[PDB]
Amino acid sequence: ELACPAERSGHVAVSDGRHMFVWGGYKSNQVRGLYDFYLPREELWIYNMETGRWKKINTEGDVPPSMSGSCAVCVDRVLYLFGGHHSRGNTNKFYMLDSRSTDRVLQWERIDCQGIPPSSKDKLGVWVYKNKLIFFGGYGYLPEDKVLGTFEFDETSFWNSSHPRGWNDHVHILDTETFTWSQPITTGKAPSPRAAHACATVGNRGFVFGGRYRDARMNDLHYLNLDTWEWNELIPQGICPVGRSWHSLTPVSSDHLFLFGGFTTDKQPLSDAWTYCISKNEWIQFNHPYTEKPRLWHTACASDEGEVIVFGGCANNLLVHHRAAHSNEILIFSV
């Protein structure tokens, strides 16, 4: 039980129900004074959900650049990775890693997708439905191609970064048979542009909660109907979790979403957990023993054994860069 991944935020974690695959993210190197120290691109860490042990694999092939904020999912044992932030900025590249392989070395493949891709961006979300991947939102450059939806600049990026960036409300579909991008024509009122929101799919509903937009970290809840492309805003019956970004939102049943952690508008790291019951349209607080372990920019993955496995993220205000306390702890929630 020696092996364990380095601490990190902004990594991805995806699951086949038995394994949790962890890639990427960043941490600090305090000796060198580096607070954007990306984790090694060729490493893939596998957390075995039954044994609680980690194994590090070195991948080959078209290994993606080291990145924070990428959007990944595992569908039928294939890892798909879109977007992110590397040392030279945001990307819209798409990578696949097929784990249905009896080869001893796992191989990344960079895919040349057809159609018009999303803009280059990070800190977004993805829904999975009927052999397609449906991406929503994010933070990145002004879109350069014809795109349906809206984009709003982050005002401070006109002086605080080398190139202006902003939030989008875009919905893009990738068909994984042909690797073709498209966009659906939606109806209803889409959520505002946002990044660092959390997405979760139950049935044909793509839920999205919270996120950052302009000067707010939000607590609104919406779903996109993945058959009809109608957006719906859900107004819960009572008290809601406070507005936040960098939280996780994970399906735990056919009727429940599990929310943990995040970062408030006033920059407080959060250790609260809640369950949203879909049929009752109500939020309920979830009692747990990690009240002194707030996390933001962690990942959460459900196991087949009725648990949510939280990994990584930052315990304190990650925007105070030199003091940001990234974690490598596994927090297990019994749901």
Partner: peptide, 7 residues
């Protein structure tokens, strides 16, 4: 730190 902007 560009990586954390926008969240």
């Amino acid at each position: 730190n560009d990586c954390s902007c926008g969240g």
